[PDB]
Amino acid sequence: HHHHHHMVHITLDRNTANSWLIISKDRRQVRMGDTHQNVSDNKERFSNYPMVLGAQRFSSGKMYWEVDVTQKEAWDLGVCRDSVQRKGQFSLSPENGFWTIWLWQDSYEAGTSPQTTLHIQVPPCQIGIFVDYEAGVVSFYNITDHGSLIYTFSECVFAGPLRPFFNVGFNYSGGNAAPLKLCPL
């Protein structure tokens, strides 16, 4: 792809984080802590899952960023509406305001309803995410495999400002402690 020149500097919004997450000083990395991280509750925090938003909001244009997923067993990545539900249980779907892919139990899937199987021959260590607001497109690229396409959501109905979306996943296995990292431009 030739989307690299729309690169944007994403940082994580601490106030949206689940209370067990640890965000680095530079706001470019996030991992699951082994306990509550001693923050106050607020209406922005994702309560049920290890999720956090980017601080940036997008309502126009083309945007691109990259995320490092090295050595993780489970994660979700993409974009979501600013107005997505934060509390309680929900599914990741465009009807609920999410345009995402994930890794879970050694398979990759797109967050459609129901979920869609992805076909990835080279397990990615870094994911590229491209949003074209006007076109209604969210695309995912395998940086480890020469930028090969993973998935495209089209005819998207964003219906509001978009935020970068992250889920570091639970660590029940002891094998999913590694962080998500926003990669340098």
Ligand X SMILES: O=C(CN1CCCC1=O)Nc1nccs1
For ligand X, the binding residues (CB under 6 A) are 57, 59, 82, 94-95, 112, 153-157, 161
Distance CA 93, CA 99 (A): 7
Smaller CB distance to ligand X: residue 70 or 113?
Answer: 113
Smaller CB distance to ligand X: residue 4 or 57?
Answer: 57
The first and second tokens of residue 61, run together, are 């244009």
Nearest to 166 by CA among 114, 88, 94, 103: 103
- Beta carbon of residue 81, minimum distance to ligand X (angstroms, whole number): 10
Collapsing DSSP to helix, strand or coil, 156 comes out as coil
Smaller CB distance to ligand X: residue 38 or 60?
Answer: 60
- Beta carbon of residue 14, minimum distance to ligand X (angstroms, whole number): 17
Distance CA 21, CA 121 (A): 31
Cis before 114? omega within 30: yes
DSSP-derived secondary structure letter, 43: T
Phi, psi angles (nearest 5°) of residue 82: -60, -35
- Beta carbon of residue 95, minimum distance to ligand X (angstroms, whole number): 5
- Beta carbon of residue 161, minimum distance to ligand X (angstroms, whole number): 4
Smaller CB distance to ligand X: residue 94 or 169?
Answer: 94
Q: Are 178 and 72 in contact (CB under 8 A)?
A: yes
Query: Whose CB is nearest to ligand X?
Result: 94
Smaller CB distance to ligand X: residue 31 or 163?
Answer: 163
Distance CA 114, CA 133 (A): 24
